[PDB]
């Protein structure tokens, strides 16, 4: 009963092949040359289609390429906050967009004396771009306040998270 169940079928009958032998199998040989067409038929083809149809799907490709080559040089094209050196002056970042200069001055005065404050806003609209420059009366106090406001999950911005660091100027 080991192999009494896997009894194979009877041997397959023989039929004379209807295809070509493995030795005679080939694709088309004697493929004629391409030079003869160029002399005669090419002239007729060029005469009967003067101009080809426009290549339109490349328009979108080159158009988006134009965006890439158009964004960069235009951002590079360019050239209240011109205070003293930032050794004693403090800087803030990521402040609220709808914030003001007096509120920023008060927030900076919460942890250090302020001598000169002037917030630089975007030129497009009169809204605080989130940058406030505060001159401090003590560089050590300003550095300590910046460290505290950076380690304490960011200073309290009105509608954002305002991390603080050096002015880096």
């Amino acid at each position: 009963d080991v192999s009494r169940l896997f009894k194979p079928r009877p041997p397959l009958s023989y039929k004379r092949p209807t295809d070509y032998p493995y030795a005679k199998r080939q694709t088309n040989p004697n493929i004629t040359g391409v030079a003869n067409l160029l002399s005669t038929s090419l002239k007729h083809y060029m005469e009967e289609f003067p101009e080809g149809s426009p290549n339109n799907h490349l328009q979108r490709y080159e158009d988006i390429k134009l965006s890439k080559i158009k964004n960069a040089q235009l951002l590079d094209r360019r050239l209240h906050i011109k205070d003293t050196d930032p050794y004693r002056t403090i800087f803030i970042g990521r402040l609220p967009y709808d914030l003001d200069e007096i509120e920023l001055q008060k927030y900076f005065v919460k942890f250090g004396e302020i001598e000169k404050i002037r917030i630089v806003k975007d030129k497009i609209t009169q809204k605080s771009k989130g940058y406030a420059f505060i001159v401090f009366k003590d560089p050590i106090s300003s550095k300590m306040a910046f460290k505290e406001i950076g380690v304490h999950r960011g200073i309290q911005i009105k509608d954002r998270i305002c991390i603080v660091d050096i002015e880096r100027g």
Partner: protein
């Protein structure tokens, strides 16, 4: 026979296909698996037109009658390199509702047997 328009080779499982090869030989058997697209046919019988009767198919009694030599061969796996094109010929023995019924049956039985197997193999 009519076959659904959105029916890939996965839907035609146990349909009785008509597989054609490069050398003018056809295979007529039930599809049961695939992959490179090399099928497995259950009872496929291979047909061919002999060279002696090939001349009757050429353009010109009114109705042609071709005697095709056929061989019987069972549970054969083809190779996708030779396959040329496949056609469908007949529907399976079971209707669609009965097919769904037996699938649900086997799924229930398999889930129960798997649960019992886990219960035995853990304890």
């Amino acid at each position: 026979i009519q076959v659904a328009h959105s029916s890939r080779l996965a839907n035609l499982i146990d349909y009785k296909l008509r597989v054609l090869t490069q050398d003018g030989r056809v295979y007529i058997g039930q599809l049961m698996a695939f992959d490179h697209m090399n099928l497995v046919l259950n009872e496929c019988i291979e047909e061919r037109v002999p060279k002696t009767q090939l001349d009757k198919l050429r353009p010109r009694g009114t109705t042609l009658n071709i005697k095709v030599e056929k061989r019987v061969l069972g549970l054969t796996i083809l190779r996708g390199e030779q396959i040329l094109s496949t056609v469908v010929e007949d529907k399976p023995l079971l209707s669609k509702k009965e097919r769904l019924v037996r699938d649900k049956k086997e799924k229930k039985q398999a889930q129960k047997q798997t649960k019992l197997r886990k219960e035995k193999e853990k304890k």
